[PDB]
Write a protein that binds this ligand. Structure first.
Ligand code: 6RZ
Length: 116
């Protein structure tokens, strides 16, 4: 509360670490469904069904222009990618399993990197 400060972690390296994590995501062989925005004119239903589309290139732009206030908002967008993927694709479709794989890959890196 007012004049009662909680010890807070060093966040000075968060931007650089989030960037390195995103790069590893981008270079994963199963990253191909998530590199660019889903083409709304090509995929029937996506615009109507998915209220908040997200992809790695959009995350990369937001990260590169100071649109993430903190690392938690960054993880929210990353998880949004895979949440959207689960909504629209069957679990054992090529795109569907890519999403499950990529989510698992992200969460371990997240823990290994920040949750010390
Ligand atoms: C991730 C996702 N989710 C739902 C449908 C498609 C996709 N990914 C596609 C590769 C994008 S497209 C078909 O090139 O426009």
């Amino acid at each position: 509360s007012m004049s009662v400060k909680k010890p807070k972690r060093d966040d000075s390296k968060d931007l650089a670490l989030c960037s390195m994590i995103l790069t590893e995501m981008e270079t994963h062989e199963d990253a191909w469904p998530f590199l660019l925005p889903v083409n709304l004119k090509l995929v029937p239903g996506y615009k109507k069904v998915i209220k908040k589309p997200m992809d790695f290139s959009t995350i990369r732009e937001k990260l590169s222009s100071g649109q993430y206030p903190n690392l938690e908002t960054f993880a929210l967008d990353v998880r949004l990618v895979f949440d959207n993927c689960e909504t629209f694709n069957e679990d054992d479709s090529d795109i569907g399993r890519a999403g499950h794989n990529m989510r698992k890959y992200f969460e371990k890196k997240w823990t290994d990197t920040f949750k010390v």
